[PDB]
Design an enzyme around this catalytic site. Structure first.
Site, mmCIF file in Angstrom:
data_model
loop_
_atom_site.group_PDB
_atom_site.id
_atom_site.type_symbol
_atom_site.label_atom_id
_atom_site.label_comp_id
_atom_site.label_asym_id
_atom_site.label_seq_id
_atom_site.Cartn_x
_atom_site.Cartn_y
_atom_site.Cartn_z
ATOM 1 N N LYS A 73 -57.928 38.091 -12.415
ATOM 2 C CA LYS A 73 -57.701 39.303 -13.191
ATOM 3 C C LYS A 73 -56.294 39.855 -13.003
ATOM 4 C CE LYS A 73 -61.418 41.758 -13.589
ATOM 5 N NZ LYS A 73 -62.348 42.207 -14.666
ATOM 6 N N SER A 259 -53.537 43.763 -11.145
ATOM 7 C CA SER A 259 -53.740 44.933 -11.993
ATOM 8 C C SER A 259 -53.882 46.206 -11.164
ATOM 9 C CB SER A 259 -54.986 44.753 -12.865
ATOM 10 O OG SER A 259 -54.898 43.564 -13.636
#
Ligand SMILES: [Fe+3]
Ligand SMILES: [Fe+3]
EC number: 3.4.21.-
Length: 691
Positions: A73, A259
């Site tokens: 991610k 992130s």
């Protein structure tokens, strides 16, 4: 201590070497520092960064997709810029290069020899194999798409393919021994320039690369005219006409980071400085975007000219764009699973009440309608951009945002026309006439006037909605000039705002007292109905809504507790002239005319969507066969779920198929002015993508 040092992950030795030079020059000029982590592949670097052992790595679009999946991610934080200083671009073109002499077209490649930049790379794999699919005769999974490619081309170089399992795919490759068909510079036919060399040497018939490669690699233009381009229109054009002859337009390579705590700021800081100081011809001692002789594209693309910061809202899916993102996913799907998804409509529900109603609809749609959902309307729009949703009904305010993101209106909610006709037989073709944005106050507050409404307490449907916000606030803004919207009224309920702000003060969240100011039906004061309840319960002194909202919620038309006794006579409209009128005279006492709510979608879904919705409303619509026996689309009990409850039918746009055309010049101008005071991340996100 996040700005200690940026740890850049390398995937090769000379990459580590160049990185080390970078590190010294940065210290050599007292710039933001950087350290060099060594790995042997993009995947290892993605993993490294994921587990806090590295900070940043530059990746091709295809590995940006990979990097954004769980568990990793990661997300693009900075985009490579190409073109020139006069015409910079954060995109490039996947093309198919051939030698000038042959006479085969793109659609005639069977049995030929292909050169690819690498397995799973954008220009080298994802685009060409996606384009050639119809010719592949691939039965789908579980047979790996590689197998079909190995049968299609007589032989190719696809660096990183399993030569053991797909030997044809590694045949033309030039690597020596264990380095044969390797995903690295050890393999001379690796990457853009390698695949171009693979063609030059005559090893292959076609090279799948980007538009610039031929110009980077051939100085003398006489040799450049020895090469040609295959166009998807099965024609051949010169290598300079790539703009009119390419397989796809794709997003530039990008720098990825976590992130969460990815040190984005530190990362961009280093980059900007690195770029200013060691950019294109900034200093001869070090060149950020140059590679030593036998090397190409170390750390960053050679001949890149700088970076552009990727807005925060954008994830890997948004970055890649709906076309490319879903094309990549499609590569692991059968042509029947892809055709099924192309046929079904995925609605986006906002909050659990809408999802709840959506699922009920889904169960009765006979495979045509399924459901997605999110907690805000902007998150839903994002889902539509990423292709994990297709459509939704939006207030004109969100049609603007949607349209600036590339979305388009398809059908509109048609409401009980201006006493024109009965339950209209020709509703679907009756042109929309807009609705009336009004300011409601209690009859008793005889002093309240439009001139004295400032500084009082306000109730709004939500931020960025037509009646609840854009129109009142736009009017107030056009007087003063203040962008301090939270200073217009003492307190408000204006869902979608900052919970700690005075614009959230009157909101009251759910029955448990949670989700205050959340821009969805969980907030009790959200929407047309909610903003009116906000006033009836004496929370604000003015509710910005439409006139039918009052009609629908008084005189026993709503038997819910808070409203069961409400009489239409207990309320009045504020007129801009300073007068006040009964609700029933809204046509002579309203702030403005609002454009009907409309269903928006991606351009690819328009025709399917139109057919499904028409069908569905014939079954569950106002005069639907299965309404009210089974289900009614436009009913929910004053809760306006999915659609307005007073929708007569979804009607044709009559040629107003763009947000600008649909919303109107004046309205679009109004919101644009409002948006100078503040824009959303989605809006910032989409402006970056549109460029
Ligand atoms: Fe690429
Ligand atoms: Fe509205």
């Amino acid at each position: 201590g996040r700005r200690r040092s940026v740890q850049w992950c390398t995937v090769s030795q000379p990459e580590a070497t160049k990185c080390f030079q970078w590190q010294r020059n940065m210290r050599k000029v007292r710039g933001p520092p950087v350290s060099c982590i060594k790995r042997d592949s993009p995947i290892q670097c993605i993993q490294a960064i994921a587990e806090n052992r590295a900070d940043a790595v530059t990746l091709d679009g295809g590995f940006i997709y990979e990097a954004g999946l769980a568990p990793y991610k990661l997300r693009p934080v900075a985009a490579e810029v190409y073109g020139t200083e006069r015409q910079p671009r954060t995109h490039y073109y996947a093309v198919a290069v051939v030698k000038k002499g042959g006479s085969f077209q793109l659609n005639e490649l069977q049995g030929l020899k292909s050169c690819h930049t690498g397995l799973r790379r954008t220009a080298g794999w994802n685009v060409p194999i996606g384009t050639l699919r119809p010719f592949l005769n691939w039965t789908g999974p579980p047979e790996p798409i590689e197998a079909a490619v190995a049968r299609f081309f007589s032989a190719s170089c696809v660096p990183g393919a399993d030569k053991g399992q797909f030997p044809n795919l590694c045949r033309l490759c030039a690597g020596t021994g264990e380095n044969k068909c390797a995903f690295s510079s050890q393999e001379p036919y690796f990457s853009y320039s390698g695949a171009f060399k693979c063609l030059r040497d005559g090893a292959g018939d076609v090279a799948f690369i980007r538009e610039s490669t031929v110009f980077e690699d051939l100085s003398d233009e006489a040799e450049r005219d020895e090469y040609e381009l295959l166009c998807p229109d099965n024609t051949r054009k010169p290598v300079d006409k790539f703009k009119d002859c390419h397989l796809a337009r794709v997003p530039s390579h990008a720098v990825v980071a976590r992130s969460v705590n990815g040190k984005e700021d530190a990362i961009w800081n280093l980059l900007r400085q690195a770029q200013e100081k060691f950019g294109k011809d900034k200093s001869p001692k070090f060149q950020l975007f140059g590679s030593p002789s036998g090397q190409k594209d170390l750390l960053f693309k050679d001949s890149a000219i700088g970076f552009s910061r990727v807005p925060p809202r954008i994830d890997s899916g948004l970055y890649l764009g709906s076309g490319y993102f879903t094309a990549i996913q499609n590569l692991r799907k059968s042509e029947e699973e892809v055709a099924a998804r192309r046929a079904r409509v995925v609605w986006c529900a906002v909050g659990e009440q809408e999802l709840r109603k959506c699922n009920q609809w889904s169960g009765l749609s006979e495979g045509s309608v399924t459901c997605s959902s999110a907690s805000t309307t902007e998150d839903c729009i994002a889902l539509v951009l990423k292709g994990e949703a297709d459509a939704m009904s939006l207030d004109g305010g969100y049609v603007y945002t949607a349209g600036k993101c590339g979305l388009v209106p398809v059908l509109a909610e048609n409401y009980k026309s201006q006493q024109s006709s009965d339950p209209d037989p020709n509703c679907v073709d009756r042109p929309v006439e807009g609705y009336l944005a009004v300011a409601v106050v209690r009859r008793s507050d005889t002093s309240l006037t439009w001139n004295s409404v400032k500084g009082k307490k306000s109730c709004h449907t939500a931020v960025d909605r037509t009646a609840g916000w854009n129109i009142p606030m736009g009017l107030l803004f056009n007087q003063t000039g203040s962008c301090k919207f939270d200073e217009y009224f003492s307190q408000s309920c204006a869902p979608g705002s900052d919970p700690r702000s005075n614009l959230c003060a009157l909101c009251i969240g759910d029955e448990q007292g949670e989700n205050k100011c959340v821009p969805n039906s969980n907030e009790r004061y959200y929407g047309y109905t909610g903003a009116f309840r906000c006033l009836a319960e004496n929370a604000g002194d003015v509710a910005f809504v439409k006139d039918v909202t009052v009609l629908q919620n008084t005189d026993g038309n709503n038997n819910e507790a808070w409203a069961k006794d409400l009489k239409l006579a207990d309320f009045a409209l504020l007129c801009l002239d300073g007068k006040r009128k009964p609700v029933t005279e809204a046509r002579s006492c309203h702030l403005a005319m609002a454009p009907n709510h409309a269903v928006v979608s991606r351009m690819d879904k328009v025709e399917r969507l139109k057919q499904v919705l028409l069908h569905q409303q014939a079954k569950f619509g106002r005069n639907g066969s299965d309404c009210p026996d089974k289900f009614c689309l436009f009913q929910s009990e004053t809760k306006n779920l999915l659609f307005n409850d007073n929708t007569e039918c979804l009607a044709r746009l009559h040629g107003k198929t763009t947000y600008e055309k649909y919303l109107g010049p004046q309205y679009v101008a109004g919101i644009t002015n409002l948006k100078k005071c503040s824009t959303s991340p989605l809006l910032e996100a989409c402006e970056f993508l549109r460029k």
